[PDB]
């Protein structure tokens, strides 16, 4: 049986290590936290530190805000009812204001209300957790790739909670909280637009989404079939190419006719991934402000 | 109408993209060669982008790319044909001569270093407070090759310090001296590491390093690239 | 012509067939047996689809459709109008994929690299033998299978899921977009990284792994690791195409009723199915 490095054969420890400094305020790092032997079976066995500023605990807060109103309303719809909420777990649902509330904040709690609270605790914690992901990235100095590729997920999340409900008049086109419900929602959209198949954006984003899942099996099994000669270690790889860039250079190069380097790899790898959101967002921001049926549409713009 | 526009412009700026990426990954390796190392006649229709420079870390330069393409080694294969698009036969023996399979590039002689400016790879008794944490040990372990002979003893794990992991096992062979084996080309078992890629007879050739202490760059390329070439070149010496 | 690294590369040896009968190059393709069987099976499935496009009767991509063996035919042969082209493409189909892949494992064994880039392939493989083969004997008909055309497989894709209610309720199918979400999620993340390391603010030094274990370390207090995160991707990967072929493959054949009723097991438990309240209650 040859090895494959899929999973470790001896996983070594050494000191906790605490990381780079460079303008990082280190008073707000945490302490390091346990370390999982069954996380270094596959990855690093070190948990923390993590980082914890006024911005990451606005977030935190918002967050279980968000989550902590949607789980106050199921426990209303289950009587306060132990089992009912086990066992409706997935039925339940905090649904948007109806129709004719429009884009109101009038709505009564239990009919809307509780709806636009937890929202608005779900879009603090979502945006301030984007200014993390640019502020740690400052911090170190390093580019800000992270955040744009993060706005690019924000952009979907906001049309359909946000932008799309706006533009049509109403709160009640947006999403609703619950496991099954916003699989009825995602159903029903497509039924109400005359099917998404016949929407371009929506087979673009499916393009795309099928296109990750191509590009990184491609990609991390290149990088393991040639981690023999370190090939894992691709900032150095960048700065000096090794034998294990050249070899899958030239496993692409022979099986398909063209390649890419260590570095432009992963340009494919960003845009790939960003642009299933990104035609996803424009997909869906179309459909009923511009475009009532894609079926109807792909009559005439086909 | 504004939909026919937006799919429009996205199929324009999806073209923008995919010539952008490409020109991004000409950056090593063009322009493109005859087989006899002058440049090829037909470039594909790609032009080489502008060049960028990365700044290294602890006084190391810049690399710019594209720039001048050197092998900064000798090839030691030769036609097998009379035009283009054949195997090119080893001259000499293709594990020492680092051809193949047992390729290597000429990667600076220097060790990669951690963010702090310390070796990345150490041995693990040069490493302080780190042990072997999970999994069998595989210090003192017998090494057995691909013949099914005994080829030395394991004496230490080389680590990388900042991710913590084992990225080499260093092998005692019969005469006193060590050899680095990579971590992924080795099986570690209950009574015995198995190396599949080299019979015992191979492990003397593997390429020595100057410092027991650290490896190069470049000592790292001439270890993997050998033992991977044990793959195809060991094959009459392998059993089953 | 070739790449300024690569004729140190080029050397004899790596097949599985054929000695160094096909061991050469087309440009910078190359060749091996498997290389002339994928270029066969390639050329005439595309030669039988550019056919049955005139016994159909049109050229427009957009329009040209293979269709499989009408339900009645079972798992027979038939007429090349009435579905026998299909079958015979979708053989074709197969030996080019099968074949692609076994020209891979030669251009690893050239290249002194590991099989894993084939080992992933061949799970694409077996999704598409899923479709078109799997499912379709295990459940009586060739006709069950999806036709080959750029639109009307996407017809096939609602009528088979509309069959049992929305499909979106298939639990196989759940876990399965589950990895597909999670990979594109970890493909942003693992390309932005390594980029912001190695293009970091203007004038900077290139970052280190160590940034990058920083970076993420700070940002959600874990960090997976350089080895780790090429793992991840070929296993979320590897897992979404799994769970894709389970979900379709369960799906008519020991499960056929709407899928939405399977999760009444949960519900109708026997210490809460009757406690009144709740929406199931
Ligand atoms: C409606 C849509 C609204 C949706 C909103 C969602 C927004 C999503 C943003 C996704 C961006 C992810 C890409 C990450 C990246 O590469 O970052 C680079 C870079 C990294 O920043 P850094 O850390 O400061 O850089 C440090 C390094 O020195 C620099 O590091 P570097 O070297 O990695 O950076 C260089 C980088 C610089 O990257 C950029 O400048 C990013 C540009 C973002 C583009 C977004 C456009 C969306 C597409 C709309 C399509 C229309 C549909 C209708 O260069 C590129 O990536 C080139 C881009 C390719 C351009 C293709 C042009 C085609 C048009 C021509 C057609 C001709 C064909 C003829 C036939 O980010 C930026 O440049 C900032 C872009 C942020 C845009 C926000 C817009 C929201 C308002
Ligand atoms: C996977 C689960 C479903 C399915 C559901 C969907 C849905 C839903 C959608 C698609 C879409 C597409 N599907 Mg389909 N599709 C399936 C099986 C297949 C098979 C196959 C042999 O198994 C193929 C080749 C395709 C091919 C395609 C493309 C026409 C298109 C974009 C895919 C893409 O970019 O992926 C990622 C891959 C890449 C980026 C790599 C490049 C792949 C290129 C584009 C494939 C071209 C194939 C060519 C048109 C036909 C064969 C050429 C021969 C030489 C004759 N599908 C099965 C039945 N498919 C979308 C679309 O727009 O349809 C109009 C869409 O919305
Ligand atoms: C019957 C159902 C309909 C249909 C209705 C829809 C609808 C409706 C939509 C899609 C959309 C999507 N569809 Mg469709 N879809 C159908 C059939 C398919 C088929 C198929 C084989 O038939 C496929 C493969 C797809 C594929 C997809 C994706 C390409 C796309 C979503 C991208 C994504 O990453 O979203 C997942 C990513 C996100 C939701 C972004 C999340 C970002 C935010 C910021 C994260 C916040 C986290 C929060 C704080 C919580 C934290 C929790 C803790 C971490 C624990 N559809 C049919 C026709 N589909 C979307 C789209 O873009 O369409 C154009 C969309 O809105
Ligand atoms: C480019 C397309 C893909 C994309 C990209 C993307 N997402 C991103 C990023 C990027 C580049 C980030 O930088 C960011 C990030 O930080 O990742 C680590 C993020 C992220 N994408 C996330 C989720 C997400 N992404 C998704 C999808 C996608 N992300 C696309 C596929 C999806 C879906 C629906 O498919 C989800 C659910 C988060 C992990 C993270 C953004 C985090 C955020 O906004 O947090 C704010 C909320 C809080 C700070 C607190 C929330 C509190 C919890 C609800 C508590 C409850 C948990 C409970 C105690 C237990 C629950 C069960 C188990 C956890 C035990
Ligand atoms: C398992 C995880 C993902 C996966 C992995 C994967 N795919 C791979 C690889 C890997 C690891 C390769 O090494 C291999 C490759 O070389 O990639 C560049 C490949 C590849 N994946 C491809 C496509 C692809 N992968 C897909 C998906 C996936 N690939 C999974 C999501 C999809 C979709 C729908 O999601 C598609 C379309 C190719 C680019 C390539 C394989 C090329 C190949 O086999 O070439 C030999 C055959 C030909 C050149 C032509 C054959 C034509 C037939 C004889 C006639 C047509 C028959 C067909 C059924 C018609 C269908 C019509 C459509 C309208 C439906
Ligand atoms: C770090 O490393 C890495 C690299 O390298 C340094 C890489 O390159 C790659 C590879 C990745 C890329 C180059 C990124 C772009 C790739 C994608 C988006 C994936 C999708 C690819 C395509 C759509 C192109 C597929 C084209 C094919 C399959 C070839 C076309 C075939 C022909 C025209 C002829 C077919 C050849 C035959 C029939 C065989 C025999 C030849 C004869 C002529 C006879 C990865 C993963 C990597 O991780
Ligand atoms: C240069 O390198 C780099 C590194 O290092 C230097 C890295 O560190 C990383 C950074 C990566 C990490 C730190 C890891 C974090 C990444 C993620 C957040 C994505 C992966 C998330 C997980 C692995 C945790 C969650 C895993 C799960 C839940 C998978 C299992 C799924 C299920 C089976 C259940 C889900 C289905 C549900 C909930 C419905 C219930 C269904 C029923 C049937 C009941 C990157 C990107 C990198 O690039
Ligand atoms: C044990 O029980 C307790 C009580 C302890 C719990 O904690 C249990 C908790 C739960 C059971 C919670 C379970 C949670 C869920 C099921 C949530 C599932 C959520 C989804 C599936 C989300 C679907 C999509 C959500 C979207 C698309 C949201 C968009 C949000 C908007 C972008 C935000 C826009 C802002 C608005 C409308 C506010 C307007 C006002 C301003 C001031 C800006
Ligand atoms: C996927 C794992 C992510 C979990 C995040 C872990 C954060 C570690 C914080 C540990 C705090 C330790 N200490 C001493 C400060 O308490
Ligand atoms: C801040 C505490 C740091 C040390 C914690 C160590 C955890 C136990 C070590 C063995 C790991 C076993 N397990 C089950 C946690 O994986
Ligand atoms: C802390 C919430 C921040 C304000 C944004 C949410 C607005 C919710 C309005 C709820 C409706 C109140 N009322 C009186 C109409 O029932
Ligand atoms: C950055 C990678 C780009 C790869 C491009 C993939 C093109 C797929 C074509 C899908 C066609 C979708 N649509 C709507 C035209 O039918
Ligand atoms: C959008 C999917 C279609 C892409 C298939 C074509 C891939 C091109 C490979 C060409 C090889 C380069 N060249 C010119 C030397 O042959
Ligand atoms: C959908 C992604 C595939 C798009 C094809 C990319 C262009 C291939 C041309 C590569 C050029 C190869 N060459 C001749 C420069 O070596
Ligand atoms: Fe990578
Ligand atoms: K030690």
Not at chain 1, 183 to 188: A, Q, R, S, V
Not at chain 2, 59 to 67: A, E, K, W
């Amino acid at each position: 049986a040859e090895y494959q490095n899929i999973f470790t054969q001896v996983q070594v420890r050494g000191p906790a290590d605490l990381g780079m400094t460079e303008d990082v305020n280190l008073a707000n790092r945490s302490g390091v936290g346990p370390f999982s032997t069954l996380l270094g079976w596959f990855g690093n066995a070190q948990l923390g530190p993590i980082y914890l500023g006024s911005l990451g605990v606005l977030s935190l807060f918002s967050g279980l805000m968000w989550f902590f109103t949607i789980g106050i309303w199921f426990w209303y719809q289950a009587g306060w009812n132990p089992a009912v909420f086990l066992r409706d777990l997935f039925f339940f649902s905090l649904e948007p204001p109806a129709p004719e509330y429009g884009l109101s904040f009038a709505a009564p709690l239990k009919e809307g209300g509780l709806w636009l609270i937890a929202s608005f605790f779900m879009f603090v914690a979502v945006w301030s957790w984007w200014g993390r992901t640019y502020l740690r990235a400052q911090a170190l100095g390093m580019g800000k790739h992270t955040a744009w590729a993060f706005l690019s997920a924000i952009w979907l999340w906001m049309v359909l909670g946000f932008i799309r409900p706006i533009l049509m008049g109403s709160w009640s086109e947006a999403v609703p909280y619950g496991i099954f419900s916003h699989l009825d929602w995602t159903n029903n959209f497509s039924l109400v637009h005359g099917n998404l198949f016949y929407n371009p954006f929506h087979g673009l984003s499916i393009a795309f989404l099928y296109g990750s899942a191509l590009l990184f099996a491609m990609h991390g099994a290149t990088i393991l079939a040639v981690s023999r000669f370190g090939g894992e270690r691709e900032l150095e790889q960048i700065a000096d190419r090794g034998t294990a860039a050249e070899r899958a250079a030239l496993f692409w190069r022979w099986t398909m006719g063209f390649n890419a380097t260590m570095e432009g790899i992963h340009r494919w790898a960003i845009w790939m991934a960003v642009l299933v959101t990104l035609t996803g967002g424009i997909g869906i921001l179309l459909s009923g402000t511009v475009v009532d049926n894609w079926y109807v549409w792909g009559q005439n713009h086909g | 109408d504004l939909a026919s526009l937006a799919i429009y412009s996205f199929w324009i700026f999806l073209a923008g993209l995919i010539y952008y990426l490409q020109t991004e990954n000409m950056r090593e390796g063009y322009p493109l060669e005859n087989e006899d190392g002058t440049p090829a006649a037909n470039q594909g229709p790609f032009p080489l982008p502008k060049p960028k420079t990365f700044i290294l870390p602890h006084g190391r330069g810049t690399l710019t790319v594209p720039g001048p393409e050197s092998e900064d080694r000798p090839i030691a294969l030769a036609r097998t044909a009379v035009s283009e698009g054949f195997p090119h036969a080893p001259t000499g023996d293709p594990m020492k001569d680092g051809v193949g399979p047992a390729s290597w590039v000429a990667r600076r002689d220097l060790p990669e270093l951690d963010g702090h400016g310390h070796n990345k790879i150490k041995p693990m008794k040069a490493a302080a407070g780190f042990h072997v944490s999970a999994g069998k040990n595989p210090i003192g372990l017998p090494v057995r090759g691909c013949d099914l002979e005994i080829a030395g003893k394991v004496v230490d794990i080389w680590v990388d310090i900042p991710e913590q992991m084992a990225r080499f096992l260093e092998v005692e062979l019969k005469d006193g001296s060590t050899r680095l084996l990579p971590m992924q080309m080795v099986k570690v078992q209950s009574n015995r590491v198995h190396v599949n890629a080299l019979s015992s007879d191979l492990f003397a050739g593997i390429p020595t390093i100057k410092s027991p202490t650290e490896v190069t760059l470049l000592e790292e390329d001439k270890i993997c690239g050998y033992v991977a070439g044990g793959l195809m070149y060991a094959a009459p010496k392998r059993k089953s | 012509a070739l790449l300024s690294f690569e004729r140190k590369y080029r050397v004899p040896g790596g097949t599985l067939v054929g000695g160094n009968l096909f061991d050469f190059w087309v440009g910078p393709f190359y060749v091996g047996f498997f290389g002339v069987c994928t270029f066969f099976f390639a050329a005439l499935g595309i030669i039988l689809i550019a056919w049955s496009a005139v016994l159909q009767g049109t050229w427009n991509p957009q329009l040209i459709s293979v269709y499989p063996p009408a339900l009645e035919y079972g798992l027979g042969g038939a007429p090349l109008a009435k579905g026998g082209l299909w079958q015979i493409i979708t053989i074709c189909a197969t030996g080019a994929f099968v074949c692609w892949a076994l020209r891979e494992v030669e251009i690893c064994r050239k290249l002194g690299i590991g099989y894993h880039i084939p080992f992933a392939f061949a799970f694409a493989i077996l999704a598409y033998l899923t479709l078109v083969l799997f499912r379709p004997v295990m459940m009586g008909a060739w006709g069950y299978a999806f036709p080959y055309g750029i639109w009307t497989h996407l017809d096939w894709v609602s009528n088979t899921g509309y069959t049992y209610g929305n499909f979106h309720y298939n639990p196989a199918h759940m876990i399965a977009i589950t990895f597909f979400f999670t990979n594109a999620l970890a493909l942003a993340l693992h390309g932005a990284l390594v980029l912001s390391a190695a293009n970091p603010e203007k004038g900077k030094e290139m970052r280190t792994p160590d940034h990058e274990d920083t970076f993420f370390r700070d940002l959600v207090g874990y960090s997976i690791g350089t080895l780790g995160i090429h793992r991840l991707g070929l296993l979320l990967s590897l897992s979404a195409v799994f769970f894709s072929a389970l979900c379709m493959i369960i799906t008519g054949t020991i499960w056929f009723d709407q899928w939405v009723d399977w999760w009444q097991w949960w519900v109708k438990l026997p210490w809460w199915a009757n406690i009144p309240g709740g929406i199931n209650g």
